[PDB]
């Protein structure tokens, strides 16, 4: 149950994304990997840019 709170805390830390965007596939797959990090001193901005470039990779029509 603690892992879900970590996922949600990281979701609000990334952007304050709404759960509606949490249900998105790019989020649904990467939130678990962002869980096994950000407990370190790494950054908050790095996760925003990572989500940017991954969401971009996802949408190549």
């Amino acid at each position: 149950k603690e892992e879900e709170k970590k996922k949600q805390q990281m979701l609000t830390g990334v952007l304050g994304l709404q759960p509606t965007m949490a249900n998105h596939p790019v989020l649904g797959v990467f939130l678990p990997k962002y869980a096994k990090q950000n407990g370190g001193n790494v950054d908050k901005t790095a996760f925003r840019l990572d989500l940017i470039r991954m969401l971009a990779l996802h949408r190549l029509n």
Partner: protein
């Protein structure tokens, strides 16, 4: 760790023991040991081999090139003795006496330069002078040195090194009983060490080139089989396993493919 695939714990332990005792066993070649590949093949037939064995042999060749790159010994230690012998003996004899082979000393200065293949070419021509000093009125003799059983044991040691570059043993040909002169025994040392050095580097570059070619080939076949799907997990697996691989890249790529094994176990159907 030790991610491999949907393989049995028995097969994972087999591959563990093999990639641990790679430096222990002889004739280190994945073609020469096909039991690794049929330990790599996946349970329940080709309906799940047709993608998973491509992925799994890809993981085998990646970690095989990884353990080669991590467990190569440093052959410059034997080239250092090559430089000491070739410097001290050859140039200084032909300068101190018999001042006609200075063209061949320019050749052995270019042999001191790292052009080993062309350098060990005409080791016959720089052996003929050792033949002239070991036996009077110079003839042509066999290329390996004067003692017969030592001559055979040199070739046995060279075949041992060619089979297993990772574990090599010098021969240390020197003897206190010296019918053969000191300087020509140093020439015998130089010939044996030069052959050993060039043989180890040839066989190392051979297996390294083979492993990298197999990695590129399994990438091409595996991307061709992953091509058809357009789900996000499948195209992310395409973009991960499509990334270019050089030998300096392969170790970081193994770390990457562990952190992406966390997904691409589930990304594969």
């Amino acid at each position: 760790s030790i991610p491999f695939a949907w393989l049995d714990r028995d097969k994972v332990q087999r591959l563990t023991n093999f990639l641990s005792n790679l430096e222990n066993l002889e004739n280190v070649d994945l073609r020469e040991h096909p039991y690794v590949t049929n330990s790599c093949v996946v349970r329940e037939g080709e309906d799940v081999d047709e993608l998973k064995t491509l992925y799994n042999t890809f993981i085998l060749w990646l970690m095989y090139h990884y353990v080669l790159s991590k467990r190569k010994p440093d052959y410059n230690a034997i080239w250092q003795d090559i430089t000491k012998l070739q410097n001290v003996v050859n140039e200084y004899l032909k300068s101190k006496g018999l001042n006609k082979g200075n063209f061949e000393n320019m050749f052995t200065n270019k042999e001191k330069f790292e052009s080993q293949f062309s350098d060990i070419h005409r080791a016959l021509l720089r052996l003929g002078n050792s033949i002239r000093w070991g036996s009077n009125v110079p003839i042509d003799t066999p290329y390996v040195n004067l003692t017969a059983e030592d001559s055979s044991e040199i070739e046995n040691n060279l075949q041992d090194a060619e089979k297993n570059m990772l574990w090599y043993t010098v021969y240390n040909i020197n003897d206190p009983w010296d019918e053969n002169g000191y300087l020509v025994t140093s020439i015998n040392k130089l010939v044996y060490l030069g052959k050993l050095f060039v043989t180890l580097n040839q066989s190392w570059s051979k297996l390294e080139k083979v492993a990298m070619s197999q990695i590129v080939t399994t990438q091409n076949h595996l991307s061709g089989h992953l091509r058809k799907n357009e789900n996000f997990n499948a195209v992310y697996s395409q973009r991960v396993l499509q990334t270019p691989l050089t030998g300096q890249r392969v170790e970081s790529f193994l770390k990457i493919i562990t952190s992406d094994y966390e997904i691409i176990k589930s990304s594969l159907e």
